[PDB]
Amino acid sequence: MSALQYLDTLRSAHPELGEWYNTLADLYQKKLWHQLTLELEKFVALAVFQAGDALIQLYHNFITDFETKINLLKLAHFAVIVSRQYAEKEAAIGYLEGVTEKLHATKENRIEEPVLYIKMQIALFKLEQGEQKECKKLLDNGKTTLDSMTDIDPSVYATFYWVSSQYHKARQEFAEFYKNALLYLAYTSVESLSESFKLDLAFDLSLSALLGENIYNFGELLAHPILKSLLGTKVEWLYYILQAFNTGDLIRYQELCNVHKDALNAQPALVANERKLLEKINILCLMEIIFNRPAEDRTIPLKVIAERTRLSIEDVEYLLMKSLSVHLIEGIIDQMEGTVHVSWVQPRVLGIPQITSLRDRLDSWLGKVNTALLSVEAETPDLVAS
Amino acid sequence: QIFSSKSIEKVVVHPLVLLSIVDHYNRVARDTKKRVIGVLLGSTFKGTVDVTNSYAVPFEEDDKDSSIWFLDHNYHESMFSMFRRINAKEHVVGWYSTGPKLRENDLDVHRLFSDYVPNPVLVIIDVQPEELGIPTKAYYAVEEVKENATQKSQKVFVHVPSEIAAHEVEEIGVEHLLRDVKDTTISTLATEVTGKLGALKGL
């Protein structure tokens, strides 16, 4: 049944878009496919048609004709937007499998990218169905396919890391969710997203970082503007808690918790893990404590570590050997006088004042080099002239 | 497991290359601030780029619009065929730039050139060196994915160690050229103290 008749029928159905349908028909008659894809991207981006089966029939009766001439990534995008609108997820899964088979039958050298895109959407759909093992298999296969091909569309990385993130969230792996979603926010432009999803993702990522084992680098998290998007919302308490973590301020986090007892009680994930983030903030306090000291005094008594941590000798030693074991730190600890010889020093997070301090230090060492050179130059004349 | 492209560990730059490049700059840019560009020929082994021979490849770049840069591929591929005929062992390894500093269009030069070599190397050679050191600095393009979302994958040139060694024949010719100047009777200390002092002037 001719596509033009379908366009006419829809035009009759929706007079409000008669001009757009006329433009689409003119493109079709003029065999104009790609700017047609652009106008179709605008058309779908218009959320007016997001409710209804009209787009499913539109695909079935219109896009099958252009599968051989339209860019495969755009075809995959349209197919996924269509699959999102199916009420039954199994039907969408079958449709995605069919389009993947058609793409494979196309036999092009670039089938792998849109095919991976569609496969990963299918894996997400089974994730919504709870079929975790199949999702993991598809994730492994997708890793393998990504490895074999280079110069990929960044959207492919973005969507893959999105779906892998949701996988690990269903797995309650805060660390791997944190890493994969950080990769996502390394690939997926912020401005393209809505503030609602921005707040939701920021909340989830901050929660994962708080619960992401072995993750203590909150500077990157604090840096990204998604959190600046959290400013002005009901979850500013969480950003303040993250700042306290980065500052290692145990007391600051203490009144932050006391003020926000209700909100923390509102989320069972934080309540059960009290010991874990308590240890984490103790360790962060320890690392910033060592950061304050120079490298010339990386020996510190266990007592001072206790008072800064308010924490017992046995437990201070426990925390020390833990944050030395995780490859967070490297060093030695002497019990006889109770001192900690860390070979543990980091390099990042400082501002204009430390720049001026390094100014003073560099002037000092320029003077030291100057006196050394002057000594050499004063010693030379009596000695090179012989 | 994505980085199947052998990372370029080091680049060895031999005299003949530098002499050819200097003569190219003189002939094409003795009295102009225009840079001279060319192509680097040789073999890559175990992450080491042997830059054996190079030839003049004429270059223009508008003094007003730096983004615009006249280099063409006809003579490039012609010389690939002709030199490879002469010496089948060699193949293209990179493209060299005669100047003190990089320019943004070096990136698009690298992009166009990588079609000929999957792992091309950009070597900047200062035809008039003022600093005490090796006049060559090696580069290769790496697709760095910044953790910031709003920027697409940007190709950034990453420095690689560059070294100067001369074949037995090239060493012979170099000493024959350098007899009127060079010093072999220096007791090793004089050399080492001089090098340490120059290093102190550096740090």
Place this chain on the structure above:
Amino acid sequence: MVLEATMICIDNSEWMRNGDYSPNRFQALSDAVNLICGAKTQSNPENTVGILTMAGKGVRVLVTPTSDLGKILACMHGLDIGGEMNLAAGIQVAQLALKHRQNKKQQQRIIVFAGSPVNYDKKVLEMIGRKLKKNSVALDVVDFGEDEEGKSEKLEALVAAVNNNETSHIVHVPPGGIALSDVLISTPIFTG
């Protein structure tokens, strides 16, 4: 015979996918470009022929000037057609690519294929043509497809801004069954 450096500013917008021209507008344009490359190479083995795409996610230079007809044919066979042509950015990158010169003595010639309507202000085209005039770059404009009111005037204005001692011409190819290559043969583009 004069040494010429030509960059074939190929459009990749939709308006070459129309079946009205020959069997396919894009195939006809590919044949025309191949014939132009062959003729320019036959004029002098030193002649340089380059390729550029105006439409898509952005103006991309597939093959900067070259005489290896194999590369040109391979890149024409692997073309992904599409997008809205960026005539202003297309011509700017065309100057970028015609300053892709080994032999500095050759001349600069732009061949522009216009198949889609030009939604560009007269003033922008005039400034671009004046920049080309300052750069002494010859521009050949091939207007093909259905003649929408305004495209021809803009192209003629650009040609006038670029005209320098009758070194720039505008060719209007009427729609029909006549192959684009046949019309292009009789144009001053080939005779020089």
